[PDB]
Amino acid sequence: SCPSQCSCSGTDVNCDGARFASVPAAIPITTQRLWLSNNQLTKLDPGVFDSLTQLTTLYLSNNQLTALPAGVFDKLTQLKELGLDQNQLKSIPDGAFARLPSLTHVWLHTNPWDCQCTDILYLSGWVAQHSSIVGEGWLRSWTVNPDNAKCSGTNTPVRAVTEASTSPSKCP
Ligand SMILES: CC(=O)N[C@@H]1[C@@H](O)[C@H](O[C@@H]2O[C@H](CO)[C@H](O)[C@H](OS(=O)(=O)O)[C@H]2O)[C@@H](CO)O[C@H]1O
Ligand SMILES: O=C(O)CCCC[C@@H]1SC[C@@H]2NC(=O)N[C@@H]21
């Protein structure tokens, strides 16, 4: 099984640059590394990754994702790398990363994180606690840089935001 327009090699499924509007069916359940980056994804329906329990890397960077559903990563307990950079995300659902105990590389930069809203506090506390794995780049050029997740319209890092500077009434 392999989606047309993706490159399949063993437990790698590389859909990087496929111009997909939607996640394709037919990604093998034994897949270990999944590139869905550089497509036109705008949403993820709940459960889309639930049968992909062997994933160790998931790259969703360079799409138009406006939100993530609660629990979308809950079955991926072997995940080490997660790419969410260069999307349209305004917050992360509460606890979205809790079931990802093996993460070593996370990309969150270049999103319009909405730091006025109380929904940002999960992400803010998470980045503060897991600062040593938040970064940028690739292979030789990987660099830890937790301040690169920035509040939209400011130069304030998401991890500097406190509850007192958020409001439940400023959440679209
Ligand atoms: C199929 C493959 O190996 N693709 C590589 C691709 O993943 C690399 O892009 C980087 O992906 C990471 C995680 O998704 C991150 O988005 C990097 O962006 S960043 O702004 O530097 O943080 C992407 O550059 C590229 C790197 O040139 O290489 C492909 O081979
Ligand atoms: O290619 C580069 O220039 C380094 C990787 C990209 C890092 C991005 S650029 C926007 C955002 N702000 C940062 O300080 N880093 C990320």
Author numbering: 1 to 172
Paper text:
As antigen receptors, the lamprey utilize a family of highly diverse proteins called variable lymphocyte receptors (VLRs), which contain multiple, tandem leucine-rich repeat (LRR) motifs. The resulting VLRB protein is a 15–25 kDa, crescent-shaped protein with a continuous beta sheet where its concave surface forms the antigen binding site. Herein, we report on the characterization of a lamprey VLRB that is specific for terminal 3-O-SGal, and was isolated from a lamprey immunized with human type O erythrocytes. This VLRB, termed O6, is the first reagent to our knowledge that specifically recognizes the 3-O-SGal determinant on glycoproteins with high sensitivity. To better understand the molecular determinants of glycan recognition, we determined crystal structures of unliganded (apo) O6 and a co-crystal structure of O6 in complex with (3 S)Galβ1-4GlcNAc. This O6 VLR is relatively small compared to other characterized VLRBs, containing 178 amino acids (~19.2 kDa) and only a single LRR variable domain (LRRV1) along with the other usual LRR and CP components (LRRNT, LRR1, LRRVe, CP, and LRRCT).
The structure of O6 in complex with (3 S)Galβ1-4GlcNAc at 1.9 Å resolution provides a detailed view of sulfated glycan recognition by this VLR. The sulfate group of the ligand forms hydrogen bonds with Gln86, His109, and the backbone amide of Gly137 in an identical manner to a phosphate ion in the apo structure. Specifically, Asp85 and Ser61 hydrogen bond to the 4-OH and 6-OH of Gal, respectively. The side-chain NH of Trp35 hydrogen bonds with 3-OH of GlcNAc, while Asp16 hydrogen bonds with the nitrogen of the GlcNAc acetamide group. Two water molecules mediate interactions between Ser37 and Asn62 and GlcNAc and Gal hydroxyl and O groups. Trp138 of the C-terminal loop packs against the face of the GlcNAc residue, a feature that has been observed in all glycan-binding VLRs to date. The binding interactions observed in the crystal structure are consistent with the CFG glycan array and ITC data where VLR O6 makes specific interactions with 3-OH of GlcNAc and the 3-SO3, 4-OH, and 6-OH of Gal. The 2-OH of Gal, 6-OH and 1-OH of GlcNAc remain open for substitution or glycosidic linkage. Comparison of the apo and glycan complexes shows no movement of the C-terminal loop and only small changes in residue rotamers (including Trp138), indicating that the VLR is preconfigured for glycan binding (RMSD 0.28 Å for 172 aligned residues).
